[PDB]
Amino acid sequence: FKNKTVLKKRCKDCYLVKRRGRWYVYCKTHPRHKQRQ
Amino acid sequence: NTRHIAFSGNKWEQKVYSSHTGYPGGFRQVTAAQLHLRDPVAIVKLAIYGMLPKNLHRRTMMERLHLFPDEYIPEDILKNLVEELPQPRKIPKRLDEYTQEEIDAFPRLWTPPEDYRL
Amino acid sequence: GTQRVCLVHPDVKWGPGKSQMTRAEWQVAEATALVHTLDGWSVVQTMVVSTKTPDRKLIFGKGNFEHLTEKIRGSPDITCVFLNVERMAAPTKKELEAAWGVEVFDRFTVVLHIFRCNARTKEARLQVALAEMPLHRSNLKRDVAHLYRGVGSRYIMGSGESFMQLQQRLLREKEAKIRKALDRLRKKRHLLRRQRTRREFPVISVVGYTNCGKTTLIKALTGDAAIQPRDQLFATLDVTAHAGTLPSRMTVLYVDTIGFLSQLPHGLIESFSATLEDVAHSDLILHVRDVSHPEAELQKCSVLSTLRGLQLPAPLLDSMVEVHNKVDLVPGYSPTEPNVVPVSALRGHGLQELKAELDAAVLKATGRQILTLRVRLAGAQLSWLYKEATVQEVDVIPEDGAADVRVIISNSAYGKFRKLFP
Amino acid sequence: GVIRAIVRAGLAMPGPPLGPVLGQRGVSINQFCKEFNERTKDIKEGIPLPTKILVKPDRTFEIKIGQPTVSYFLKAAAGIEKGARQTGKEVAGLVTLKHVYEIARIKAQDEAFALQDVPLSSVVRSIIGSARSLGIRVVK
Amino acid sequence: VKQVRVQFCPFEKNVESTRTFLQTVSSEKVRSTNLNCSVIADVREPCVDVLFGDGHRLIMRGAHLTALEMLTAFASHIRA
Amino acid sequence: RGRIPGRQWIGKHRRPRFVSLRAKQNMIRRLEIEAENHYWLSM
Amino acid sequence: SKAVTRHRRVMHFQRQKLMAVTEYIPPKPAIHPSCLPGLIRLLRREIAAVFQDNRMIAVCQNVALSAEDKLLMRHQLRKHKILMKVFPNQVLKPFLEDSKYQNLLPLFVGHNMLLVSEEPKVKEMVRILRTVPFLPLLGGCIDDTILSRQGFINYSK
Amino acid sequence: SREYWRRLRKQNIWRHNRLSKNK
Amino acid sequence: KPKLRFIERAPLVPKVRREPKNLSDIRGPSTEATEFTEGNFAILALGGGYLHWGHFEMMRLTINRSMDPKNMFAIWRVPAPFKPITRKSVGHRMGGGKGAIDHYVTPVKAGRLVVEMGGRCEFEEVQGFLDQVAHKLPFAAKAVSRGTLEKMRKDQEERERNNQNPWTFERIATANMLGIRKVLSPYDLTHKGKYWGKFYMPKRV
RNA sequence: CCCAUAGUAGGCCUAAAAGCAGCCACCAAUUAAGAAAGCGUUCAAGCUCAACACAAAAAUCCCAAACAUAUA
RNA sequence: ACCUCGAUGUUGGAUCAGGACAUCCCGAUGGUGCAGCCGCUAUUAAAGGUUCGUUUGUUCAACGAUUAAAGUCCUACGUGAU
Ligand SMILES: Nc1nc2c(ncn2[C@@H]2O[C@H](COP(=O)(O)OP(=O)(O)OP(=O)(O)O)[C@@H](O)[C@H]2O)c(=O)[nH]1
Ligand SMILES: [Mg+2]
Ligand SMILES: [Mg+2]
Ligand SMILES: [Mg+2]
Ligand SMILES: [Mg+2]
Ligand SMILES: [Mg+2]
Ligand SMILES: [Mg+2]
Ligand SMILES: [Mg+2]
Ligand SMILES: [Mg+2]
Ligand SMILES: [Zn+2]
């Protein structure tokens, strides 16, 4: 998880989810794509 | 029934009650939910204390104030009681509480498709 | 900034400083090249002046110093003076500046200025800041004179440290911060090297004197196009790795390095150790030699001394493969020493022979073995060998459904293979 | 699975280009090259021939072969050994529309190659495009 | 999974679900997943009968079931 | 916490000031009076 | 502070009030407007010509086959004079009522592929379908006479 | 004309590929 | 020569006379280079500011790298840095005369085009890197086509026409109602409240 | 979301570079597919895509209490 | 150059430490060019801890030996009516 003010899907598998009050980019194939707002 | 007060919005989690014991590192900040779970009277007591004028009569007024978490009230206090003030907020009715007559009166606003699993 | 410069070359004729490998004309040419590299100004005038004693508050004997003073002060076009010396003490700088009414620069300051001007990456900026710290400490007097404002010993309050002394304290802390930052940079560069080290990429560090064609040679070897050699000096100011294939179909990382100049303070180049440690962590060192340049021997001495000061491993110092570039400029050049390859990067003449020689050197230096190995087809062993080693020839035995592959394999890969496919 | 190759009829040589890839899926390379040489004898010699081998899970061969390539065939028709470098301006041979028709007569007849379009236009257009891509001009 | 049979009457309506189920199950990817698994797309209300490798039968009457629901039940019973 | 540097209302970093509905209504009322003044001066 | 500053300078409170009062007020439209009230004809002619020319028509769902399997089926069909056709349902729907095919409406939904011919090789076509236990024969209408699959089987035999 | 639309589709695919080169 | 031309750090003939920082050259709407010329796309400056050689290099490198030379061309719509900005020595006390010329800038006013692009391309192909450059510019900026520029101008006109507010900054300032000219600036009589220093409020009517 | 056969491993270049190391050409078959926009392969193989079809953080301790709905 | 020149005593050190977290160690967690060991990076966490010495008046730095670590700061560069 890296903190980013602008969230970008870095591959087809990245998906956006608003959890615990903020947006997250989650990815299972490339976990390094994981971003937190 | 001060235990059964209701906060609008997310105040239960956002409203923070702050105090300082005086000793270093004695700054305590407890959310409304935590303070309510600890003391079932603190929320209303603090609200009244804040709203009362900030002079030397405030503590006497708070002495006149009586707070009870639940329906139970002491017998002497009950005998003292004179009038009951109307509740400031009218409690909305739940579906379980709505009568069938009211449900029938309220119209159906749309025809759901017959072949929808819902 | 648009500063016409008068070049002053002190020619030492006896005793220490009497170089036996270079001539004043060649040194003047090198200094002119340095200023032209610095760009934006040129040598309006040149003066080579004798100096029996090179170490003085005034580098020249009183007579020659007065002669130079007259010439410099009578020439109005001159805006600055570049004294072709390694480093000049603050007293000498102050006295010459006052006498000649101009700004005096030494080779140290000129190289520092070109670095500051053409440094792009933050790593380069930090390293040149470290290299500047000496020049700063030398120049605080002049730099903070106007801040000093002629106040001393009369104020009785505050930190007892004088203005000069507390400026020294501030510069001490500044240097400490810079050194801490370079330590962090060294750690980060180690992180970067980790992956290539684990994959056991053979690495060849290309070193040599400045403007030897190191970058051009790397471009020729790799076949890349984004690599841009320059006519200017100190063009390559960052250490970068470029992949290139050898005749044995082996990939090798050529590591480009900073150029080396003679007659410079060691600390200048040594301040780039944070990024030049990639040479220390190399597998082979390729020394490029602009044999066409008249000062080839002096450049050899300078580069060898610089490497020794950089403290590269002695085994790495040994086996340094020497290539003589720019041979086209010297028609009919015949290499004398053995184990030396003549090449012409621009014209790409001896590049094939150089590639073969450095391939052999890599095989010797990386503990890699060229051996024939029999594998079973359909067992993924062939694909594994392709991916984890450089295969050179696959002779298929159809009768046994197998194949003998001639592979240059490291010991680690060989062990992994023997365990994975018994 | 299906393995595609452009093996040259005479050049059935096991090993460098075929050995590894063929073995990876499980094969008898001797059998494969023997059958390919049988096909080479059946057809002219010394010419690339696309193949459509299907390595069955039972470890058996069904070699399917058809017409020679289009590029080499056109080069032979135009009398060229190596194709043009630019191929847009460089030209090394010319072929007539009649010759193109004649070669197409024996082209759209291979099952695997899918060239079974009844209209002559469908195939003549494709071969014309192939020639235009190559260093061959379409006469008249 | 062993065998799958889909029956429907196209001239009769309410067959879209079963037709799409057939087009999805017969998909070359699905059949290649288990070449042994045999489909029999008979046709003659609409129904789907799936016999699994363990001799277990699933019957989905797709008269009022969407193809998504039928396929989800089919996959759940595959997972078993 | 929550300090305004220097003096409120003068510096580069002033305490923010926000217009209330009351202030907006007052200004609009004055504007209406002045518009009527324009009309009565136009003749 | 200069008139032009690198930061948004604080406005005099009266200027702030002026800016607030003179803000753009969009026109409110009373009732929200939101809740107030070539190739196609080429294939039209193609479908009309197909219907007129073919004496027998059948349809199927050849969508579960591989590219090569579909190509092989097409080759087997071309071995006979029968021709397989693909058209979008979106434009096939009008044609049924256009050509007076009322019973054909609940037959072309989803993927649909036509098998138009004049000489029925239906016997060998069904034989070919048999070795592939899917891709059911779907109802068709020979010479303006709707035939179910049982009708096609009887006609074949 | 079938070929008109075929060429149109080819050009549209080219345009999409050019746009996607950077994406 | 489709690729964007190199811009020199300072004029070949350096200016000798230090000149004041007339910020009015940044203040207010732009009256020059406000329209397209030999191009269909551009970077519009929605605010005033000074462009340095660093900004020019950023623009040149980004646009040159990201453009297609055989199908796109770019052209500067802003002159090379000419206005000299002077800086005193670090830590110098106030007084002692004006500082020496340090850098050169080029002023840019709101509503001006900085770079203009054209060629066999549509907006979507260029808007990406044009927006990158605009975002990295020292003032608010936006990648705008001819169509989009006309659309935004027409939208501004439509808002001005149909605004339901009886009161407009233009009217109040011109009539000096409430005596607000005591608080306003003479420039405001022409800026109509849409400009504040170097900033242009586009939503402002 | 579904789906992807194929003139052919387009030529040249190279040991090989087959859509994809690089240069030229970029036509064309199918109802519908870039001589390929991305992964991937030493090269192939394989995976997709375009196509048909249906905002914030600092150092003593937060900082009125609270409140969304009774007619300007 | 805004308070203080009818005095607001000044750098280091001792003593006692209050506080912030932008965490050096200890806790929890995501990523990794995370095989393991060391690590690097980020989120959360300030309850607790954060060494002793040789020169040097030194804060620092260098060096020696350690440590889990020998954190960055604010406190009138905390604290001389101690
Ligand atoms: N290799 C080579 N370079 C030549 C020759 N003749 C001229 N040159 C010039 O040599 C220069 C070498 O530039 P680089 O290769 O960048 O220099 P370098 O050795 O990397 O050193 P730095 O400039 O300090 O990075 C270029 O300007 C070439 O044009 C020649 O025969 N061989
Ligand atoms: Mg270089
Ligand atoms: Mg204040
Ligand atoms: Mg698709
Ligand atoms: Mg004062
Ligand atoms: Mg004053
Ligand atoms: Mg006093
Ligand atoms: Mg934290
Ligand atoms: Mg201080
Ligand atoms: Zn991802």
Short mmCIF file of N, CA, C and O in Angstrom, two decimals, chain C residues 250-334:
data_model
loop_
_atom_site.label_atom_id
_atom_site.label_comp_id
_atom_site.label_asym_id
_atom_site.label_seq_id
_atom_site.Cartn_x
_atom_site.Cartn_y
_atom_site.Cartn_z
N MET C 250 25.98 -13.63 -24.77
CA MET C 250 25.88 -13.34 -23.35
C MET C 250 25.63 -11.85 -23.16
O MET C 250 26.27 -11.02 -23.81
N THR C 251 24.70 -11.52 -22.28
CA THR C 251 24.36 -10.13 -21.99
C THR C 251 25.28 -9.61 -20.89
O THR C 251 25.50 -10.29 -19.88
N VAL C 252 25.81 -8.41 -21.09
CA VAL C 252 26.76 -7.80 -20.17
C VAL C 252 26.37 -6.35 -19.96
O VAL C 252 25.97 -5.66 -20.90
N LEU C 253 26.47 -5.89 -18.71
CA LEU C 253 26.15 -4.51 -18.36
C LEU C 253 27.43 -3.68 -18.40
O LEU C 253 28.32 -3.87 -17.58
N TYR C 254 27.51 -2.76 -19.36
CA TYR C 254 28.57 -1.77 -19.39
C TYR C 254 28.16 -0.61 -18.49
O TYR C 254 27.08 -0.04 -18.65
N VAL C 255 29.03 -0.27 -17.55
CA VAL C 255 28.77 0.78 -16.58
C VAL C 255 29.60 1.99 -16.99
O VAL C 255 30.84 1.94 -16.95
N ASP C 256 28.93 3.06 -17.38
CA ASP C 256 29.61 4.30 -17.71
C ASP C 256 29.97 5.05 -16.44
O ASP C 256 29.29 4.95 -15.42
N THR C 257 31.07 5.80 -16.50
CA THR C 257 31.64 6.41 -15.31
C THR C 257 32.04 7.85 -15.60
O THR C 257 32.08 8.30 -16.75
N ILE C 258 32.32 8.58 -14.52
CA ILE C 258 32.78 9.96 -14.63
C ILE C 258 34.17 9.98 -15.25
O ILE C 258 34.97 9.06 -15.08
N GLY C 259 34.45 11.05 -15.99
CA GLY C 259 35.78 11.22 -16.54
C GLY C 259 36.79 11.65 -15.49
O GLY C 259 36.45 12.19 -14.44
N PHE C 260 38.06 11.40 -15.79
CA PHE C 260 39.16 11.73 -14.90
C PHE C 260 40.07 12.77 -15.56
O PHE C 260 40.41 12.65 -16.74
N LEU C 261 40.45 13.78 -14.78
CA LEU C 261 41.42 14.78 -15.20
C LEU C 261 42.64 14.73 -14.31
O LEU C 261 42.57 14.35 -13.14
N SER C 262 43.77 15.12 -14.88
CA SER C 262 45.01 15.25 -14.13
C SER C 262 45.06 16.60 -13.44
O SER C 262 44.37 17.55 -13.82
N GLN C 263 45.89 16.68 -12.41
CA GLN C 263 46.12 17.93 -11.69
C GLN C 263 44.82 18.48 -11.10
O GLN C 263 44.46 19.64 -11.31
N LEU C 264 44.12 17.62 -10.37
CA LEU C 264 42.93 18.02 -9.64
C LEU C 264 43.02 17.52 -8.20
O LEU C 264 43.67 16.50 -7.94
N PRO C 265 42.39 18.21 -7.26
CA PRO C 265 42.30 17.66 -5.91
C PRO C 265 41.62 16.30 -5.93
O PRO C 265 40.64 16.08 -6.66
N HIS C 266 42.14 15.37 -5.13
CA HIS C 266 41.56 14.04 -5.09
C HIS C 266 40.13 14.09 -4.59
O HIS C 266 39.25 13.39 -5.11
N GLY C 267 39.86 14.94 -3.59
CA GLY C 267 38.54 14.99 -3.00
C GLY C 267 37.45 15.24 -4.02
O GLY C 267 36.33 14.75 -3.88
N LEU C 268 37.75 16.00 -5.08
CA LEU C 268 36.76 16.27 -6.11
C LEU C 268 36.18 14.98 -6.67
O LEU C 268 34.97 14.74 -6.60
N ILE C 269 37.04 14.13 -7.23
CA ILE C 269 36.56 12.88 -7.80
C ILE C 269 36.07 11.94 -6.70
O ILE C 269 35.08 11.23 -6.88
N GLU C 270 36.76 11.92 -5.56
CA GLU C 270 36.38 11.00 -4.50
C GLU C 270 35.02 11.32 -3.90
O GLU C 270 34.41 10.45 -3.27
N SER C 271 34.52 12.54 -4.10
CA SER C 271 33.17 12.87 -3.65
C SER C 271 32.10 12.18 -4.47
O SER C 271 30.94 12.15 -4.04
N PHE C 272 32.44 11.62 -5.62
CA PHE C 272 31.52 10.83 -6.43
C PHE C 272 31.61 9.35 -6.12
O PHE C 272 31.07 8.54 -6.88
N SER C 273 32.27 8.97 -5.02
CA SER C 273 32.39 7.56 -4.68
C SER C 273 31.03 6.92 -4.45
O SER C 273 30.86 5.72 -4.69
N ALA C 274 30.05 7.70 -4.00
CA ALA C 274 28.73 7.14 -3.73
C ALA C 274 28.16 6.46 -4.96
O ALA C 274 27.47 5.43 -4.85
N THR C 275 28.43 7.00 -6.15
CA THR C 275 27.96 6.41 -7.39
C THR C 275 29.05 5.65 -8.14
O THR C 275 28.73 4.83 -9.00
N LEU C 276 30.32 5.91 -7.84
CA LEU C 276 31.42 5.18 -8.46
C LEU C 276 31.72 3.87 -7.75
O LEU C 276 32.58 3.12 -8.22
N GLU C 277 31.04 3.58 -6.64
CA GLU C 277 31.21 2.29 -6.00
C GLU C 277 30.68 1.15 -6.87
O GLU C 277 31.00 -0.01 -6.60
N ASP C 278 29.89 1.46 -7.90
CA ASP C 278 29.49 0.43 -8.84
C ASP C 278 30.70 -0.18 -9.53
O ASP C 278 30.69 -1.36 -9.89
N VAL C 279 31.76 0.61 -9.72
CA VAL C 279 33.00 0.06 -10.26
C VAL C 279 33.61 -0.92 -9.28
O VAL C 279 34.11 -1.98 -9.68
N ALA C 280 33.59 -0.59 -7.99
CA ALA C 280 34.12 -1.51 -6.99
C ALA C 280 33.36 -2.82 -7.00
O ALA C 280 33.95 -3.89 -6.80
N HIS C 281 32.05 -2.77 -7.23
CA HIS C 281 31.22 -3.96 -7.30
C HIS C 281 31.12 -4.52 -8.71
O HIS C 281 30.14 -5.20 -9.04
N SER C 282 32.12 -4.25 -9.55
CA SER C 282 32.10 -4.72 -10.92
C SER C 282 32.75 -6.10 -11.02
O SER C 282 33.25 -6.65 -10.04
N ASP C 283 32.73 -6.65 -12.22
CA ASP C 283 33.40 -7.91 -12.52
C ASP C 283 34.62 -7.73 -13.41
O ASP C 283 35.59 -8.48 -13.26
N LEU C 284 34.59 -6.77 -14.33
CA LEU C 284 35.77 -6.43 -15.10
C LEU C 284 35.83 -4.92 -15.26
O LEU C 284 34.80 -4.24 -15.18
N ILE C 285 37.03 -4.40 -15.45
CA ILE C 285 37.24 -2.98 -15.71
C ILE C 285 37.91 -2.83 -17.06
O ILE C 285 38.95 -3.45 -17.32
N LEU C 286 37.31 -2.00 -17.91
CA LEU C 286 37.81 -1.72 -19.25
C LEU C 286 38.32 -0.29 -19.26
O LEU C 286 37.55 0.66 -19.08
N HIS C 287 39.62 -0.13 -19.46
CA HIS C 287 40.27 1.17 -19.45
C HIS C 287 40.45 1.65 -20.88
O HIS C 287 41.15 1.01 -21.68
N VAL C 288 39.82 2.77 -21.21
CA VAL C 288 39.87 3.35 -22.54
C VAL C 288 40.97 4.39 -22.58
O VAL C 288 41.17 5.14 -21.62
N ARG C 289 41.70 4.44 -23.70
CA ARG C 289 42.91 5.24 -23.83
C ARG C 289 42.85 6.03 -25.13
O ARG C 289 42.93 5.44 -26.21
N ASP C 290 42.73 7.35 -25.03
CA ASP C 290 42.77 8.20 -26.22
C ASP C 290 44.23 8.30 -26.66
O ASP C 290 44.91 9.30 -26.42
N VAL C 291 44.71 7.24 -27.30
CA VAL C 291 46.12 7.17 -27.66
C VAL C 291 46.52 8.34 -28.54
O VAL C 291 47.68 8.77 -28.55
N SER C 292 45.56 8.89 -29.30
CA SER C 292 45.87 10.03 -30.15
C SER C 292 46.31 11.23 -29.32
O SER C 292 47.17 12.01 -29.75
N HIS C 293 45.74 11.39 -28.13
CA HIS C 293 46.07 12.55 -27.31
C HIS C 293 47.55 12.50 -26.93
O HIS C 293 48.04 11.45 -26.50
N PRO C 294 48.29 13.61 -27.06
CA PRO C 294 49.72 13.57 -26.74
C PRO C 294 50.02 13.16 -25.31
O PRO C 294 51.07 12.57 -25.05
N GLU C 295 49.12 13.46 -24.37
CA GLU C 295 49.35 13.22 -22.95
C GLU C 295 48.86 11.85 -22.49
O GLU C 295 48.44 11.71 -21.34
N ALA C 296 48.90 10.85 -23.37
CA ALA C 296 48.34 9.55 -23.02
C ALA C 296 48.98 8.98 -21.76
O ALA C 296 48.29 8.42 -20.90
N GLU C 297 50.30 9.09 -21.63
CA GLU C 297 50.98 8.52 -20.47
C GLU C 297 50.59 9.24 -19.19
O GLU C 297 50.34 8.60 -18.15
N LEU C 298 50.52 10.57 -19.23
CA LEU C 298 50.10 11.32 -18.06
C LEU C 298 48.67 10.97 -17.68
O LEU C 298 48.34 10.86 -16.49
N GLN C 299 47.80 10.80 -18.68
CA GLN C 299 46.43 10.40 -18.40
C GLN C 299 46.39 9.01 -17.77
O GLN C 299 45.58 8.75 -16.87
N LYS C 300 47.24 8.10 -18.24
CA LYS C 300 47.35 6.79 -17.61
C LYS C 300 47.68 6.94 -16.14
O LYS C 300 47.02 6.34 -15.27
N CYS C 301 48.71 7.72 -15.83
CA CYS C 301 49.09 7.91 -14.44
C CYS C 301 47.94 8.49 -13.63
O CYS C 301 47.65 8.02 -12.52
N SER C 302 47.26 9.49 -14.19
CA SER C 302 46.17 10.14 -13.47
C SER C 302 45.05 9.16 -13.17
O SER C 302 44.54 9.11 -12.05
N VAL C 303 44.64 8.37 -14.17
CA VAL C 303 43.52 7.46 -13.96
C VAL C 303 43.90 6.36 -12.98
O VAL C 303 43.10 5.98 -12.12
N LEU C 304 45.12 5.83 -13.08
CA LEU C 304 45.53 4.79 -12.14
C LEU C 304 45.55 5.33 -10.72
O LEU C 304 45.08 4.67 -9.79
N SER C 305 46.09 6.54 -10.53
CA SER C 305 46.10 7.14 -9.21
C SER C 305 44.69 7.37 -8.70
O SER C 305 44.39 7.16 -7.52
N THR C 306 43.79 7.82 -9.59
CA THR C 306 42.42 8.07 -9.18
C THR C 306 41.73 6.78 -8.73
O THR C 306 41.02 6.77 -7.73
N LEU C 307 41.93 5.69 -9.47
CA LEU C 307 41.35 4.42 -9.06
C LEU C 307 41.92 3.96 -7.73
O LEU C 307 41.17 3.53 -6.84
N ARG C 308 43.24 4.06 -7.56
CA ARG C 308 43.83 3.66 -6.29
C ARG C 308 43.26 4.48 -5.14
O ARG C 308 42.99 3.94 -4.06
N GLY C 309 43.05 5.78 -5.36
CA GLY C 309 42.42 6.60 -4.34
C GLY C 309 40.97 6.23 -4.09
O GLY C 309 40.48 6.35 -2.97
N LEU C 310 40.27 5.79 -5.14
CA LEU C 310 38.89 5.33 -4.98
C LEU C 310 38.81 3.98 -4.29
O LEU C 310 37.72 3.58 -3.88
N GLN C 311 39.93 3.27 -4.17
CA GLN C 311 40.01 2.07 -3.33
C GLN C 311 39.21 0.91 -3.93
O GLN C 311 38.51 0.20 -3.22
N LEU C 312 39.32 0.72 -5.24
CA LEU C 312 38.71 -0.44 -5.85
C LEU C 312 39.49 -1.69 -5.45
O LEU C 312 40.69 -1.62 -5.16
N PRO C 313 38.84 -2.86 -5.43
CA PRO C 313 39.55 -4.08 -5.03
C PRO C 313 40.77 -4.33 -5.91
O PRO C 313 40.71 -4.19 -7.13
N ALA C 314 41.87 -4.72 -5.27
CA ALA C 314 43.09 -5.00 -6.01
C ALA C 314 42.91 -6.06 -7.08
O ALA C 314 43.50 -5.91 -8.17
N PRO C 315 42.19 -7.16 -6.84
CA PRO C 315 41.94 -8.10 -7.95
C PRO C 315 41.28 -7.43 -9.13
O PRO C 315 41.56 -7.78 -10.29
N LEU C 316 40.40 -6.46 -8.88
CA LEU C 316 39.75 -5.75 -9.97
C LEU C 316 40.72 -4.81 -10.66
O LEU C 316 40.72 -4.72 -11.90
N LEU C 317 41.55 -4.10 -9.89
CA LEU C 317 42.60 -3.29 -10.50
C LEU C 317 43.42 -4.12 -11.47
O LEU C 317 43.65 -3.74 -12.62
N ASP C 318 43.87 -5.29 -11.01
CA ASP C 318 44.49 -6.24 -11.90
C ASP C 318 43.46 -6.78 -12.88
O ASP C 318 42.26 -6.82 -12.60
N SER C 319 43.93 -7.18 -14.06
CA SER C 319 43.12 -7.70 -15.15
C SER C 319 42.36 -6.58 -15.86
O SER C 319 41.45 -6.87 -16.64
N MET C 320 42.70 -5.32 -15.61
CA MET C 320 42.08 -4.21 -16.32
C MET C 320 42.37 -4.33 -17.81
O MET C 320 43.53 -4.20 -18.23
N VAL C 321 41.35 -4.58 -18.62
CA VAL C 321 41.55 -4.74 -20.05
C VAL C 321 41.70 -3.37 -20.68
O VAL C 321 40.84 -2.50 -20.50
N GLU C 322 42.77 -3.17 -21.44
CA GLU C 322 43.10 -1.86 -21.99
C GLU C 322 42.75 -1.80 -23.47
O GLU C 322 43.19 -2.65 -24.26
N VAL C 323 41.96 -0.80 -23.84
CA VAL C 323 41.61 -0.54 -25.23
C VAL C 323 42.14 0.83 -25.61
O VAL C 323 41.99 1.80 -24.85
N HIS C 324 42.77 0.91 -26.77
CA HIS C 324 43.30 2.16 -27.31
C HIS C 324 42.30 2.67 -28.33
O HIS C 324 42.21 2.15 -29.44
N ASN C 325 41.53 3.68 -27.94
CA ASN C 325 40.53 4.28 -28.81
C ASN C 325 41.18 5.27 -29.76
O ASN C 325 42.39 5.51 -29.74
N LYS C 326 40.36 5.86 -30.63
CA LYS C 326 40.79 6.96 -31.49
C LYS C 326 41.98 6.56 -32.36
O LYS C 326 42.78 7.40 -32.77
N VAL C 327 42.11 5.26 -32.67
CA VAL C 327 43.23 4.81 -33.49
C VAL C 327 43.14 5.42 -34.88
O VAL C 327 44.17 5.70 -35.51
N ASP C 328 41.93 5.63 -35.39
CA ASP C 328 41.78 6.24 -36.71
C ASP C 328 42.53 7.56 -36.79
O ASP C 328 43.12 7.89 -37.82
N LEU C 329 42.51 8.34 -35.70
CA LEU C 329 43.23 9.60 -35.69
C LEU C 329 44.73 9.38 -35.83
O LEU C 329 45.43 10.22 -36.42
N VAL C 330 45.24 8.28 -35.29
CA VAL C 330 46.66 7.94 -35.42
C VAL C 330 46.78 6.87 -36.50
O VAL C 330 46.71 5.67 -36.18
N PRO C 331 46.95 7.23 -37.77
CA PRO C 331 47.01 6.21 -38.81
C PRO C 331 48.18 5.26 -38.59
O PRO C 331 49.26 5.65 -38.14
N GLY C 332 47.95 3.99 -38.91
CA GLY C 332 49.00 2.99 -38.81
C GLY C 332 49.54 2.82 -37.40
O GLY C 332 50.74 2.58 -37.22
N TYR C 333 48.67 2.93 -36.40
CA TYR C 333 49.11 2.74 -35.02
C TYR C 333 49.35 1.26 -34.75
O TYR C 333 48.51 0.42 -35.09
N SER C 334 50.48 0.95 -34.13
CA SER C 334 50.83 -0.42 -33.80
C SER C 334 50.88 -0.58 -32.29
O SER C 334 51.80 -0.05 -31.65
#
